Amino acid sequence: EKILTPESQLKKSKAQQKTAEQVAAERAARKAANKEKRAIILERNAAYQKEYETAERNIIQAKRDAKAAGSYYVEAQHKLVFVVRIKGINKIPPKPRKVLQLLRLTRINSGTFVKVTKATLELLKLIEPYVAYGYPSYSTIRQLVYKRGFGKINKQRVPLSDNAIIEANLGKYGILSIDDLIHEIITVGPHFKQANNFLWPFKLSNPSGGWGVPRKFKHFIQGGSFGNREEFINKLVKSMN
Amino acid sequence: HRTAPKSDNVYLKLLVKLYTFLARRTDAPFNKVVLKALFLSKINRPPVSVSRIARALKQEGAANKTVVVVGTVTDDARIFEFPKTTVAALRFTAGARAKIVKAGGECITLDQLAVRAPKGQNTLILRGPRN
Amino acid sequence: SDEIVWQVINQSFCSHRIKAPNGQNFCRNEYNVTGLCTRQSCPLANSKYATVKCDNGKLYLYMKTPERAHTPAKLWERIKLSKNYTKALQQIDEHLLHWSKFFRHKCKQRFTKLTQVMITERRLALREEERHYVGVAPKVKRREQNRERKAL
Amino acid sequence: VLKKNPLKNKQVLLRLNPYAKVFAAEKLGSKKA
RNA sequence: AAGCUCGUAUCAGUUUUAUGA
RNA sequence: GGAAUACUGCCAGCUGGGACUGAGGACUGCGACGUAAGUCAAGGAUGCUGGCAUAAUGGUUAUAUGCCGCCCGUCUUGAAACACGGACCAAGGAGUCUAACGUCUAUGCGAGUGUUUGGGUGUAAAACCCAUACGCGUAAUGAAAGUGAACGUAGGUUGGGGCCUCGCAAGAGGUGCACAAUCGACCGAUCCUGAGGAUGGAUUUGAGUAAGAGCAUAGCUGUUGGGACCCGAAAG
RNA sequence: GAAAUUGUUGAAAGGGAAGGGCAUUUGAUCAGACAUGGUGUUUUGUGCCCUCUGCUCCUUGUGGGUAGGGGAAUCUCGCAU
């Protein structure tokens, strides 16, 4: 007669088909789900682009209206800082060194975002001689997240580079793309603790141009590098990027 | 944390070789408990007496359970009565083995238990007195 | 069984292993496909085992069935593999029906190399070489040194 | 396997943020008030 | 070093508010 | 009144010049572009071309050049030092063995365990068998005299690895090992009551019972004694 | 028949120190295939090839070894030119 397949191998084909037809149907219903997901991400980014534009225009318009009406417009209190470690690991006193570990600024040239409140301002005061902090733009956060942006998944410093990763980990907290994450940073949202902590402490190079000053370890106010620099942090971090 | 067994008994290494496969593929926390228990040393695998099996089957709604001792099952002369139950272990002592068979139930190895209960349905893991 | 055969030869001696400096292990049991030895790539540990060998120019494919674990005298059943390459690979395929894809392409691979070992004939038809290796025995090396110095 | 960077390499800057196509078509950075 | 509970809200050379000499 | 232009900042603006790197190895994925067909700079270099066997190339030694480099080891003190050791070379040369007592791990068996003082046997100091005993453990509470562990799913509760039912999950409910916490009991011993110590009360106590985990071999190693890591003293 | 150490010869270096490390030049010197195909067609000639007749070991078809003749006008099936 003719040879027949083994009754384990016969089963194999059957169970493989059972999984394969399931897998192909699962895959096909995920291409459509990601296509719909892509459309949601596109309209959200349009919504944020319009939001940032109208935000800065209302600051401009309020400033124009104050001078026209002969009044003075107070600008909104800066609610987000970017702290960069400026001094090395050695000859650091106990009291600030613990605080630098608590801001995840372990190595030199490491950068993190900090929520600005009553509490954190005094923390920044302690670490004044050891860091350069300031208020970031939209542009710099965008450059930091695309180039030096890394996610903390269980442990593991994972490169972002795909929206699906942030969607899986932080989809619980309403963040579903890379620009949703950026939005949670710049505007200090309800999930800021979660989005900031998901971001791995940035690993910045020494600045492209240099520090400017001859001697680094003075306050910025008196020809140094450390302490608050407010707006010039954007110029500094972009060179360090 | 313990990774591999210190034992040199290759049959115990075959059970580890089996239960490491069932530890990650079943994703039921029964197999992870057994596979952790096989790595344990000889002082940390105390012998469960046949009396402790009898005490364990007094448990309410535990008439049709398959009791699993990762250590050794040992005989007790003091007790008279013993239920008809399937007992799974590494080593059954000749006295204990005879006691379970004559009572009605079976004495089975851990790989037989791996076949009959892969995810580990309707089971009970006993441990010997350490202190 | 066979798992117990493997572990006892994996460590605790397979008394025909060559430990290469690369850390590699080679079973020289004449019936293995890969010259290297690994689990079910060496013919003792595995119970179902195919191989291509040559006794003369005739390239046979030997085959070991677990049926014959009792009798080692007739373990390896063997079949001649024509001589043309195309029909031989097809000849191979039918024997390997419903086996591991390991022996499927590896006996195909044994046959390939052992057929291109018959480049021996190429070397031995166009031989006609006026050289041939001569030993230099150290006694002769001084019968033809210390006698020339005595000649001069 | 390797970190492709957006900002440069156009193609990876389309898998992140599909709106970048629209941003390039309308210019948007080059916008009049 | 090992065994036992846990994997947490277990804590921290830190800041803040609260309540005294 | 009319435009600019620096300056600050932005562009998911364009176009170049240079260096370094090419990791990975069938295909899966995120995408872009194209009406589609497809294609692409999209989960890490491909394509073309030249130089060869008296090759191409690559190495060793010898010195030169630029820069750098306190004399090794031991012993002090706060480190530098001081000082002690080193002419050179070969060979020799220092934590060993044993007993007593543990530690942990492995193996055998398990309420038991241990053949090897011996006897039988042997292809002979090997291996293979074994009688009667003995060693250690298996049931405790005390001082001379004693007694003796179930009110019991060997407990009541609370937790408590797991397992079972429901739920897509998230959860909830049940049963709950070892173990831990709490309330107690049995046994012996308490403070009295005094029918030689009956009887009932007062309370706690426990390498106590909760319902056995040991014995032997081996390895790792500790403690102490043996000359005891090796060499070096004034002696009787 | 090792090293210390000694002589000779050859090479190199030497203005009050040598030996070492990173890198390179110059001088001396040693390596550096009895490597020779691979593929696709075409003459032929052979055989384990076609064909006629067999013989023999054993285990399941998907066996193995081994003779006597013929034949290339089919056949690359292999190997020789």
Q: Enumerate the domain spans of chain C.
A: 3-126
Domain count of chain A?
1
What span, in angstroms and rounded, lies between the C-alpha atoms of B118 and B19? 10
Helix, strand, coil % (nearest 5) of chain D? 30, 0, 70
User: To which H or E segment does residue A183 belong?
Assistant: helix A178-186
Q: Contact C32/C85 with Cβ under 8 angstroms?
A: no
CATH code for the structural domain at C3-126 = 3.30.390.110
How far, rounded to the nearest angstrom, does the alpha carbon of residue D26 sit from its chain's CA centroid?
12
Q: What is the DSSP letter of C108?
A: H
B92: the nucleotide nearest its CA (via C1') is F110
Residue of C1, C7, C8, C10 best to disrupt the B interface, most CBs of B under 10 A: C7
DSSP H or E stretch at residue A65: helix A9-69
H-only helix segments in chain D = 12-15, 20-25
CA distances from C4 to A39, A155, C32 (A): 59, 40, 19
Q: How far apart are CA A227 and CA A124, in angstroms?
A: 8
- Residue C94, chain A, CB below 8 Å: the answer is no
Quote the CA–CA distance of C62 and C47 in Å, as a whole number.
13
Q: Gaps after which residues in chain C, C–N over 2.5 Å?
A: none
| Both structure tokens of C30 | 């004449």
- Distances in Å between the Cα of B112 and the Cα atoms of B29, B48, B117, B120 are 19, 19, 8, 12
Residues forming beta bridges with residue D24, ordered by sequence position: none
- Token pair 């210190």: residue: B6
In angstroms, what CA-CA distances link D1 with A160, A161, A199, A200?
12, 11, 20, 19
Classify the C-alpha dihedral C85-C91-C94-C96 as positive or negative.
Answer: negative
Residues 6+ apart with CB under 8 A from C138: none
Cβ separation A146–D28 shorter than 8 A: no
Domains delineated in chain B: 1-131 (3.100.10.10)
How many other β-carbons are positioned within 10 Å of the β-carbon of residue A103? 21
D10–chain A nearest CA distance, Å: 13
A54 membership: H or E segment, kind and range: helix A9-69
Type of residue at A234: N
| Structure tokens, C117 | 């070992």
Q: Please, are residues C39 and C25 in contact by the beta-carbon 8 Å criterion? A: no
How far apart (Å, rounded) are the C-alpha atoms in residues C77 and C66? 12
Where is A68: in which H helix or E strand? helix A9-69
Distance A27 CA to F181 C1' (A): 54
Resolution in A: 3.2
Helices (H) and strands (E) in chain D, counts: 2, 0
Q: Which tokens sit at A180?
A: 């949703």
CA distance C54 to A120: 82
Phi, psi of A52 (to 5 degrees): -65, -40
Closest to C92 (Cα-Cα) out of C116, C115, C109, C74: C109
Contact A116, A80 (CB under 8 A): yes
CA of C16 to C1' of G2 (A): 39
CA of A199 and C1' of F10: distance in angstroms? 26
Q: Half-sphere exposure of residue A194, counting CA atoms within 13 Å on the CB side? A: 15
**Sequence-separated contacts (24+) of A166-169 with Cβ below 8 Å:** A166/A198, A167/A37, A169/A198
Helix (H) or strand (E) holding B48: strand B48-49
Give me the residues paired with residue A14 across strands. Answer: none
Residue A88 CA from chain centroid, whole number: 24
Rounded CA separation C47/C75 (Å):
10
Q: From the CA of D22, how many Å to the nearest CA of chain A?
A: 9
Question: Which residues in B69-85 are b (16+ Cβ under 10 Å) and which e?
Answer: bbbbbbbeeeeeebbeb
CA angle A169/A170/A174 to nearest 5° reads 150
3-state helix, strand, coil in chain C (%, to 5): 35, 15, 50
Asked if A178 and D3 come within 8 Å (Cβ–Cβ), the reply is: no
Neighbours of C, requiring at least 3 CB pairs below 8 Å, are A, B
* Beta strand A157-159 pairing with A202-203: unpaired
Domain that holds residue A173: 1-241
* Number of Cβ within a 10 Å radius of residue A105: 23
d(CA A27, CA B19): 32
The helix/strand count (H/E) of chain B reads as 5, 5
Report the residue count for chain B: 131
Spatial separation of the C-alpha atoms in residues A136 and A131, rounded to whole Å: 15
Q: C68 is written with which tokens?
A: 């014959």
**Sheet strands (E) in chain A:** 80-85, 110-115, 131-134, 150-152, 157-159, 202-203, 227-230
Q: Measured between alpha carbons, how far is C4 from A215 in angstroms, rounded to an integer?
A: 72
Question: How far apart (Å, rounded) are the C-alpha atoms in residues A113 and B99?
Answer: 70
Beta strands in C11-105 (DSSP E): 17-19, 25-27, 49-54, 59-64, 76-80
Measured N-to-C along each axis, helices A94-102 and A118-126 cross at an angle, to the nearest 10 degrees, of: 130
Give me the numbers of helices (H) and strands (E) for chain C, helices first please. 6, 5
- Tell me whether residue A145 is exposed, middle or buried, using C-beta atoms within 10 angstroms of its C-beta: 0 to 12, 13 to 18, 19 or more: buried
Beta strands across the sheet bearing C49-54: C49-54, C59-64, C76-80
Spatial distance between the Cα atoms of B6 and B39, rounded to a whole number of angstroms: 7
Which of chain B's residues have a Cβ under 8 Å away from the Cβ of C8? 10
Give the separation between CA A138 and CA A186, rounded to whole angstroms: 7
CA–CA dist C50, C94 (Å, integer): 13
d(CA C10, CA C2): 12
